[PDB]
Design a protein around this ligand. Structure first.
Ligand SMILES: Nc1ncnc2c1ncn2[C@@H]1O[C@H](COP(=O)(O)OP(=O)(O)O)[C@@H](O)[C@H]1O
Lengths: 190, 191, 190
């Protein structure tokens, strides 16, 4: 579980040293947290906590006991953002399969186009979803990216031009927060 | 002058004339005397709409006082050839040629305003010259008269003899009378 | 040459004609002898306004000296068929057909200027040819007069006997006298 979970939640470091850090870190916790004559065995639950801190996540996603939140995610969102139940249930179905082992091998967890009027909580459903899953929220205004030369800001400028030192707003955001929600509003104007 | 109307789009606003904006909504306008030039514009719009959506029905408003029969065939033939059904709405008045195009619409989609009129009469084409040439041209106009009566019978549903009697002399059919004669299903009041 | 007004919009500056800019404010102008092309133009504007806002009332000025009766019906039937209430502000000379459109306006929304002059007369048409042919056209014009007289009484509310009586001979009615006849609701206060 250490090598599998670390690869998904820790992409910066390489697998060999990464697995050693999480494995070694688990033993350190067993030295200080136990008061006296506690279980010496290191269960899977003890690994999920240390790996969560390394990824700065709230331990809900990596943990295998968060099913209760996903099972009632649809009902919870209705109380926060009521209305258009068909829109809320659709998100839970895609999120459930992604976390149930049925997610795409290389595609994102989910790609959706919230085509609807203004004031129907199209963006509110996204910000509240991040709070439920306990992941960072990323918001990009597509209105700014209207000119042909604006695309460079998202991916950065090539070598030999201004802005090369900057990695890129979109690339640095996803890299900094691998587990996060990405929101692109007014995509049609892009 | 033709007024301009703006339609909001994601990228930017687009300026289109009132006739072109309605054309985008499958609304053709047949106004004035029929002619080979104006008819060419009507058929061009029909063919363009067919490519856009061969399922959606076309709407052809008819407010013409009559014109040459030759140009009318181009509009009539085009309407039947294209798959989309053309809805003919009689605005103001419909002369012999206009009424022919009016009844030429698909069954169930032909309508007339409650105050519109529908006139039908035989062709007024005339020819002059030598007696030999007159005989040749005279025989041709009778064929067109008979052909128009046969086509009107198919759409209107009346017998060839009935159309001949009504078309022998000029006749003005009011909007309610048009439904009785069989040119349209009913008045355009509800949809 | 028609002027070219400028409009201030958030997206950018747009150039419109004086008539086209007024069309945005649901203001339609009518003038000159009624013609098939002229009538279809007014009809086209009405259809566009209905789709834009079926609730906002439309305004239609009338300064025409009269024209063909057949083409005028296309404007009348269109005004009744469309949901928006099309007010009628008679700003100048209003002949029989010109007056017919003024009466066709929505009840409680028709108006006229204090110095405006409106004259109504029976439909005038002529035809020549064979004896049988003139009889058909003669019967038709009488039918049109009945239809115009019948519809005029319905909108104005005056008895059919009075409508057909005065319409026989040429009649000229001022703006204040129009209120007595029921042709118009009331003049503009300011
Ligand atoms: N169905 C809704 N339920 C709750 N709040 C809503 C709803 N629709 C709009 N809002 C409110 O509207 C505001 C903007 O929401 P947002 O999602 O940004 O709107 P939009 O999707 O139109 O961009 C917030 O205060 C949000 O709570």
């Amino acid at each position: 579980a250490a090598v599998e979970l670390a690869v998904k939640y820790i992409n910066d470091r390489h697998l060999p040293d990464k697995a050693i850090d999480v494995i070694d870190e688990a033993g350190a916790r067993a030295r200080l947290m136990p008061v006296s004559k506690r279980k010496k065995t290191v269960n899977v639950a003890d690994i999920e906590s240390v790996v969560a801190r390394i990824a700065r996540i709230p331990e809900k996603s990596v943990s295998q006991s968060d099913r209760d939140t996903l099972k009632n995610l649809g009902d919870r969102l209705k109380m926060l953002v009521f209305g258009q139940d068909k829109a809320i249930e659709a998100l839970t179905e895609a999120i459930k399969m992604a976390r149930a082992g049925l997610g795409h091998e290389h595609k994102p967890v989910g790609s959706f186009l919230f085509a609807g009027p203004t004031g129907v909580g199209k963006t509110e459903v996204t910000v509240q979803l991040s709070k439920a899953l306990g992941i960072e929220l990323l918001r990009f205004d597509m209105s700014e990216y209207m000119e042909r030369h604006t695309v460079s800001r998202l991916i950065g400028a090539p070598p030999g031009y201004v802005g090369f030192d900057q990695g890129g707003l979109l690339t640095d955001a996803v890299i900094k927060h691998p587990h996060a929600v990405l929101l692109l509003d007014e995509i049609e104007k892009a | 002058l033709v007024p301009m109307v703006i339609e909001q789009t994601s990228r930017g606003e687009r300026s289109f004339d009132i006739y072109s904006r309605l054309l985008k909504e499958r609304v053709i306008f047949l106004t004035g005397q029929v002619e080979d030039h104006m008819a060419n514009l009507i058929v061009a719009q029909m063919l363009f709409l067919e490519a856009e959506n061969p399922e959606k029905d076309i709407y052809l408003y008819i407010n013409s006082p009559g014109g040459v029969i030759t140009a009318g065939m181009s509009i009539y033939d085009t309407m039947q050839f294209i798959k989309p059904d053309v809805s003919t709405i009689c605005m103001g008045q419909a002369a012999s040629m206009g009424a022919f195009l009016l009844t030429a619409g698909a069954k169930g989609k032909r309508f007339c305003l409650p105050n519109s009129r529908v006139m039908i009469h035989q062709p007024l084409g005339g020819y002059q010259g030598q007696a030999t040439d007159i005989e040749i041209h005279a025989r041709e106009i009778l064929k067109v008269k008979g052909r128009m009566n046969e086509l009107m019978a198919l759409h209107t549903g009346q017998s060839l003899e009935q159309i001949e009697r009504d078309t022998e002399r000029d006749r003005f059919l009011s909007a309610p009378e048009a439904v009785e004669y069989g040119l349209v299903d009913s008045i355009l009041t509800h949809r």
